[PDB]
């Protein structure tokens, strides 16, 4: 219910959501050909970030209300009372900005590929391999946004900036989330 009891609505979700990530990444072109080490280490290390990008749809910047799977609604303007970490706050700010970007289906999910393969290299053997792939996936993402967002160019680089921002969200707020299973 009340104050910080909102983590039960976000709780239940996103750890079940862990595995949607693994299949998604299964469809990523070239992923399955990376070292079995790295693929999992990369999944392990960027999953959280993929969730961030992916739960941005949960928030309605227009109505300033996130809606969890199960569809109980709150408000970023209420629950910042409510004791609701400051995470879901941080989640607000990030997601409406990325939401403003008005990506498309095809784009939003390519961006997401690039975000997984961009995951912290720390646990990774073949980084030179993993950068080959990000740089390729980051190819398709340049022309698609130039294609679909022609005098809207900036969207491309404004996406490359979201990345350490997610880096940080991850290394700031991870401790309390994926550790559910």
PDB file of C-alpha atoms in Angstrom:
ATOM      1  CA  UNK A   1       0.000   0.000   0.000  1.00  0.00           C
ATOM      2  CA  UNK A   2       1.437   3.230   1.395  1.00  0.00           C
ATOM      3  CA  UNK A   3       4.945   4.694   1.264  1.00  0.00           C
ATOM      4  CA  UNK A   4       7.563   2.442  -0.349  1.00  0.00           C
ATOM      5  CA  UNK A   5       4.906  -0.291  -0.608  1.00  0.00           C
ATOM      6  CA  UNK A   6       4.958   0.628  -4.292  1.00  0.00           C
ATOM      7  CA  UNK A   7       8.040  -1.518  -4.769  1.00  0.00           C
ATOM      8  CA  UNK A   8       5.674  -4.500  -4.707  1.00  0.00           C
ATOM      9  CA  UNK A   9       3.993  -3.265  -7.867  1.00  0.00           C
ATOM     10  CA  UNK A  10       7.361  -2.688  -9.579  1.00  0.00           C
ATOM     11  CA  UNK A  11       8.906  -5.662  -7.823  1.00  0.00           C
ATOM     12  CA  UNK A  12       6.544  -8.125  -9.457  1.00  0.00           C
ATOM     13  CA  UNK A  13       7.520  -7.555 -12.990  1.00  0.00           C
ATOM     14  CA  UNK A  14      11.058  -6.988 -14.237  1.00  0.00           C
ATOM     15  CA  UNK A  15      12.537 -10.073 -12.622  1.00  0.00           C
ATOM     16  CA  UNK A  16      10.140 -12.104 -14.668  1.00  0.00           C
ATOM     17  CA  UNK A  17      11.214  -9.403 -17.129  1.00  0.00           C
ATOM     18  CA  UNK A  18      14.807 -10.627 -16.887  1.00  0.00           C
ATOM     19  CA  UNK A  19      14.186 -13.436 -19.378  1.00  0.00           C
ATOM     20  CA  UNK A  20      12.376 -11.395 -22.009  1.00  0.00           C
ATOM     21  CA  UNK A  21      15.785  -9.759 -22.282  1.00  0.00           C
ATOM     22  CA  UNK A  22      17.506 -13.056 -23.016  1.00  0.00           C
ATOM     23  CA  UNK A  23      15.214 -13.942 -25.918  1.00  0.00           C
ATOM     24  CA  UNK A  24      15.244 -10.414 -27.359  1.00  0.00           C
ATOM     25  CA  UNK A  25      19.040 -10.587 -27.384  1.00  0.00           C
ATOM     26  CA  UNK A  26      18.605 -13.969 -29.076  1.00  0.00           C
ATOM     27  CA  UNK A  27      17.162 -12.143 -32.070  1.00  0.00           C
ATOM     28  CA  UNK A  28      19.901  -9.521 -32.051  1.00  0.00           C
ATOM     29  CA  UNK A  29      21.860 -10.090 -35.290  1.00  0.00           C
ATOM     30  CA  UNK A  30      25.351 -11.340 -34.509  1.00  0.00           C
ATOM     31  CA  UNK A  31      24.821 -11.822 -30.749  1.00  0.00           C
ATOM     32  CA  UNK A  32      24.604 -15.596 -30.791  1.00  0.00           C
ATOM     33  CA  UNK A  33      28.016 -15.651 -32.509  1.00  0.00           C
ATOM     34  CA  UNK A  34      29.786 -13.927 -29.644  1.00  0.00           C
ATOM     35  CA  UNK A  35      31.776 -15.945 -27.128  1.00  0.00           C
ATOM     36  CA  UNK A  36      29.345 -17.767 -24.842  1.00  0.00           C
ATOM     37  CA  UNK A  37      31.220 -16.050 -21.980  1.00  0.00           C
ATOM     38  CA  UNK A  38      30.571 -12.518 -23.176  1.00  0.00           C
ATOM     39  CA  UNK A  39      26.909 -12.991 -24.294  1.00  0.00           C
ATOM     40  CA  UNK A  40      25.918 -13.977 -20.757  1.00  0.00           C
ATOM     41  CA  UNK A  41      28.354 -11.569 -19.095  1.00  0.00           C
ATOM     42  CA  UNK A  42      26.845  -8.906 -21.402  1.00  0.00           C
ATOM     43  CA  UNK A  43      23.302  -9.967 -20.569  1.00  0.00           C
ATOM     44  CA  UNK A  44      24.268 -10.068 -16.881  1.00  0.00           C
ATOM     45  CA  UNK A  45      25.780  -6.615 -17.110  1.00  0.00           C
ATOM     46  CA  UNK A  46      23.364  -4.595 -19.233  1.00  0.00           C
ATOM     47  CA  UNK A  47      20.014  -6.250 -18.481  1.00  0.00           C
ATOM     48  CA  UNK A  48      19.165  -3.576 -15.932  1.00  0.00           C
ATOM     49  CA  UNK A  49      19.814  -0.919 -18.495  1.00  0.00           C
ATOM     50  CA  UNK A  50      17.654  -2.679 -21.079  1.00  0.00           C
ATOM     51  CA  UNK A  51      14.885  -2.590 -18.435  1.00  0.00           C
ATOM     52  CA  UNK A  52      15.307   1.160 -17.918  1.00  0.00           C
ATOM     53  CA  UNK A  53      15.042   1.792 -21.632  1.00  0.00           C
ATOM     54  CA  UNK A  54      12.170  -0.688 -21.809  1.00  0.00           C
ATOM     55  CA  UNK A  55      10.149   0.617 -18.831  1.00  0.00           C
ATOM     56  CA  UNK A  56      10.180   4.185 -20.114  1.00  0.00           C
ATOM     57  CA  UNK A  57       6.918   3.181 -21.854  1.00  0.00           C
ATOM     58  CA  UNK A  58       5.529   2.627 -18.383  1.00  0.00           C
ATOM     59  CA  UNK A  59       5.542   6.384 -17.823  1.00  0.00           C
ATOM     60  CA  UNK A  60       3.127   8.850 -19.354  1.00  0.00           C
ATOM     61  CA  UNK A  61       5.030  12.153 -19.426  1.00  0.00           C
ATOM     62  CA  UNK A  62       1.800  13.840 -20.496  1.00  0.00           C
ATOM     63  CA  UNK A  63      -0.188  12.508 -17.578  1.00  0.00           C
ATOM     64  CA  UNK A  64       2.859  12.199 -15.306  1.00  0.00           C
ATOM     65  CA  UNK A  65       1.703   8.748 -14.203  1.00  0.00           C
ATOM     66  CA  UNK A  66       3.593   5.488 -14.508  1.00  0.00           C
ATOM     67  CA  UNK A  67       1.523   2.348 -15.040  1.00  0.00           C
ATOM     68  CA  UNK A  68       2.984  -0.997 -13.939  1.00  0.00           C
ATOM     69  CA  UNK A  69       2.138  -4.318 -15.542  1.00  0.00           C
ATOM     70  CA  UNK A  70      -1.024  -4.988 -13.585  1.00  0.00           C
ATOM     71  CA  UNK A  71      -1.906  -1.422 -14.362  1.00  0.00           C
ATOM     72  CA  UNK A  72      -2.259   0.069 -10.941  1.00  0.00           C
ATOM     73  CA  UNK A  73      -1.242   3.695 -11.472  1.00  0.00           C
ATOM     74  CA  UNK A  74       0.504   6.232  -9.293  1.00  0.00           C
ATOM     75  CA  UNK A  75       2.157   9.538 -10.124  1.00  0.00           C
ATOM     76  CA  UNK A  76       5.706  10.826 -10.106  1.00  0.00           C
ATOM     77  CA  UNK A  77       4.180  13.969  -8.619  1.00  0.00           C
ATOM     78  CA  UNK A  78       2.539  12.090  -5.743  1.00  0.00           C
ATOM     79  CA  UNK A  79       4.962   9.293  -4.951  1.00  0.00           C
ATOM     80  CA  UNK A  80       7.875  11.691  -4.584  1.00  0.00           C
ATOM     81  CA  UNK A  81       6.104  11.890  -1.530  1.00  0.00           C
ATOM     82  CA  UNK A  82       5.330   8.334  -0.619  1.00  0.00           C
ATOM     83  CA  UNK A  83       8.915   7.340   0.122  1.00  0.00           C
ATOM     84  CA  UNK A  84       9.221   5.784  -3.281  1.00  0.00           C
ATOM     85  CA  UNK A  85      12.959   5.571  -3.419  1.00  0.00           C
ATOM     86  CA  UNK A  86      14.251   8.357  -5.626  1.00  0.00           C
ATOM     87  CA  UNK A  87      14.830   5.748  -8.342  1.00  0.00           C
ATOM     88  CA  UNK A  88      11.317   5.844  -9.831  1.00  0.00           C
ATOM     89  CA  UNK A  89      11.945   9.602  -9.823  1.00  0.00           C
ATOM     90  CA  UNK A  90      15.223   9.173 -11.722  1.00  0.00           C
ATOM     91  CA  UNK A  91      13.252   6.764 -13.889  1.00  0.00           C
ATOM     92  CA  UNK A  92      10.767   9.523 -14.628  1.00  0.00           C
ATOM     93  CA  UNK A  93      13.218  12.124 -15.845  1.00  0.00           C
ATOM     94  CA  UNK A  94      15.044   9.613 -18.066  1.00  0.00           C
ATOM     95  CA  UNK A  95      11.998   8.068 -19.699  1.00  0.00           C
ATOM     96  CA  UNK A  96      10.031  11.162 -20.570  1.00  0.00           C
ATOM     97  CA  UNK A  97      13.110  12.558 -22.305  1.00  0.00           C
ATOM     98  CA  UNK A  98      13.558   9.408 -24.347  1.00  0.00           C
ATOM     99  CA  UNK A  99       9.793   9.355 -24.772  1.00  0.00           C
ATOM    100  CA  UNK A 100       9.869  12.882 -26.239  1.00  0.00           C
ATOM    101  CA  UNK A 101      12.202  11.434 -28.870  1.00  0.00           C
ATOM    102  CA  UNK A 102       9.183   9.683 -30.375  1.00  0.00           C
ATOM    103  CA  UNK A 103      11.230   6.773 -31.628  1.00  0.00           C
ATOM    104  CA  UNK A 104       9.443   4.069 -33.572  1.00  0.00           C
ATOM    105  CA  UNK A 105       8.955   0.404 -32.802  1.00  0.00           C
ATOM    106  CA  UNK A 106      11.834  -0.606 -35.055  1.00  0.00           C
ATOM    107  CA  UNK A 107      14.060   2.170 -33.700  1.00  0.00           C
ATOM    108  CA  UNK A 108      13.281   1.958 -29.975  1.00  0.00           C
ATOM    109  CA  UNK A 109      14.309  -1.742 -30.107  1.00  0.00           C
ATOM    110  CA  UNK A 110      17.426  -1.134 -32.185  1.00  0.00           C
ATOM    111  CA  UNK A 111      18.456   1.487 -29.685  1.00  0.00           C
ATOM    112  CA  UNK A 112      17.897  -1.239 -27.124  1.00  0.00           C
ATOM    113  CA  UNK A 113      20.183  -3.676 -28.946  1.00  0.00           C
ATOM    114  CA  UNK A 114      22.961  -1.095 -28.939  1.00  0.00           C
ATOM    115  CA  UNK A 115      22.342  -0.597 -25.210  1.00  0.00           C
ATOM    116  CA  UNK A 116      22.846  -4.264 -24.387  1.00  0.00           C
ATOM    117  CA  UNK A 117      25.962  -4.636 -26.500  1.00  0.00           C
ATOM    118  CA  UNK A 118      27.184  -1.433 -24.911  1.00  0.00           C
ATOM    119  CA  UNK A 119      27.015  -3.028 -21.463  1.00  0.00           C
ATOM    120  CA  UNK A 120      30.023  -2.654 -19.163  1.00  0.00           C
ATOM    121  CA  UNK A 121      32.983  -4.418 -20.747  1.00  0.00           C
ATOM    122  CA  UNK A 122      34.516  -5.184 -17.329  1.00  0.00           C
ATOM    123  CA  UNK A 123      33.495  -8.842 -17.226  1.00  0.00           C
ATOM    124  CA  UNK A 124      34.190  -9.298 -20.920  1.00  0.00           C
ATOM    125  CA  UNK A 125      36.813 -11.340 -22.718  1.00  0.00           C
ATOM    126  CA  UNK A 126      36.659 -10.148 -26.333  1.00  0.00           C
ATOM    127  CA  UNK A 127      35.840  -6.413 -26.152  1.00  0.00           C
ATOM    128  CA  UNK A 128      37.168  -5.912 -29.676  1.00  0.00           C
ATOM    129  CA  UNK A 129      34.524  -8.445 -30.676  1.00  0.00           C
ATOM    130  CA  UNK A 130      31.762  -6.724 -28.733  1.00  0.00           C
ATOM    131  CA  UNK A 131      32.673  -3.358 -30.204  1.00  0.00           C
ATOM    132  CA  UNK A 132      32.481  -4.771 -33.727  1.00  0.00           C
ATOM    133  CA  UNK A 133      28.829  -5.586 -33.036  1.00  0.00           C
ATOM    134  CA  UNK A 134      27.801  -2.347 -31.276  1.00  0.00           C
ATOM    135  CA  UNK A 135      29.422  -0.404 -34.129  1.00  0.00           C
ATOM    136  CA  UNK A 136      27.434  -2.426 -36.627  1.00  0.00           C
ATOM    137  CA  UNK A 137      24.121  -2.181 -34.785  1.00  0.00           C
ATOM    138  CA  UNK A 138      24.981   1.500 -34.331  1.00  0.00           C
ATOM    139  CA  UNK A 139      25.173   1.707 -38.128  1.00  0.00           C
ATOM    140  CA  UNK A 140      21.629   0.620 -38.868  1.00  0.00           C
ATOM    141  CA  UNK A 141      20.541   2.944 -36.052  1.00  0.00           C
ATOM    142  CA  UNK A 142      22.139   5.995 -37.686  1.00  0.00           C
ATOM    143  CA  UNK A 143      20.462   5.664 -41.074  1.00  0.00           C
ATOM    144  CA  UNK A 144      17.066   4.643 -39.635  1.00  0.00           C
ATOM    145  CA  UNK A 145      16.790   7.849 -37.573  1.00  0.00           C
ATOM    146  CA  UNK A 146      18.127   9.894 -40.487  1.00  0.00           C
ATOM    147  CA  UNK A 147      15.610   8.112 -42.670  1.00  0.00           C
ATOM    148  CA  UNK A 148      12.621   8.436 -40.326  1.00  0.00           C
ATOM    149  CA  UNK A 149      13.881  11.609 -38.561  1.00  0.00           C
ATOM    150  CA  UNK A 150      15.286  13.679 -41.463  1.00  0.00           C
ATOM    151  CA  UNK A 151      15.343  17.230 -40.181  1.00  0.00           C
ATOM    152  CA  UNK A 152      15.326  15.605 -36.747  1.00  0.00           C
ATOM    153  CA  UNK A 153      18.968  14.502 -36.860  1.00  0.00           C
ATOM    154  CA  UNK A 154      19.888  15.278 -33.243  1.00  0.00           C
ATOM    155  CA  UNK A 155      17.831  12.301 -31.975  1.00  0.00           C
ATOM    156  CA  UNK A 156      20.746  10.082 -33.003  1.00  0.00           C
ATOM    157  CA  UNK A 157      23.475  11.622 -30.807  1.00  0.00           C
ATOM    158  CA  UNK A 158      20.968  12.487 -28.050  1.00  0.00           C
ATOM    159  CA  UNK A 159      20.717   8.678 -27.797  1.00  0.00           C
ATOM    160  CA  UNK A 160      24.462   8.163 -27.564  1.00  0.00           C
ATOM    161  CA  UNK A 161      24.334  10.441 -24.552  1.00  0.00           C
ATOM    162  CA  UNK A 162      21.544   8.485 -22.844  1.00  0.00           C
ATOM    163  CA  UNK A 163      24.102   5.620 -22.545  1.00  0.00           C
ATOM    164  CA  UNK A 164      26.458   6.626 -19.703  1.00  0.00           C
ATOM    165  CA  UNK A 165      23.367   8.119 -18.109  1.00  0.00           C
ATOM    166  CA  UNK A 166      22.016   4.592 -18.097  1.00  0.00           C
ATOM    167  CA  UNK A 167      25.510   3.426 -17.104  1.00  0.00           C
ATOM    168  CA  UNK A 168      25.112   5.492 -13.949  1.00  0.00           C
ATOM    169  CA  UNK A 169      21.506   4.611 -13.214  1.00  0.00           C
ATOM    170  CA  UNK A 170      22.713   1.037 -13.296  1.00  0.00           C
ATOM    171  CA  UNK A 171      25.727   1.594 -11.057  1.00  0.00           C
ATOM    172  CA  UNK A 172      23.524   3.690  -8.768  1.00  0.00           C
ATOM    173  CA  UNK A 173      20.275   1.785  -8.397  1.00  0.00           C
ATOM    174  CA  UNK A 174      20.972  -1.814  -9.378  1.00  0.00           C
ATOM    175  CA  UNK A 175      21.553  -3.205  -5.866  1.00  0.00           C
ATOM    176  CA  UNK A 176      17.812  -3.206  -5.120  1.00  0.00           C
ATOM    177  CA  UNK A 177      16.248  -4.580  -8.281  1.00  0.00           C
ATOM    178  CA  UNK A 178      17.409  -7.536 -10.395  1.00  0.00           C
ATOM    179  CA  UNK A 179      18.452  -9.290  -7.196  1.00  0.00           C
ATOM    180  CA  UNK A 180      14.989 -10.811  -6.872  1.00  0.00           C
ATOM    181  CA  UNK A 181      15.546 -14.376  -8.031  1.00  0.00           C
TER     182      UNK A 181
END
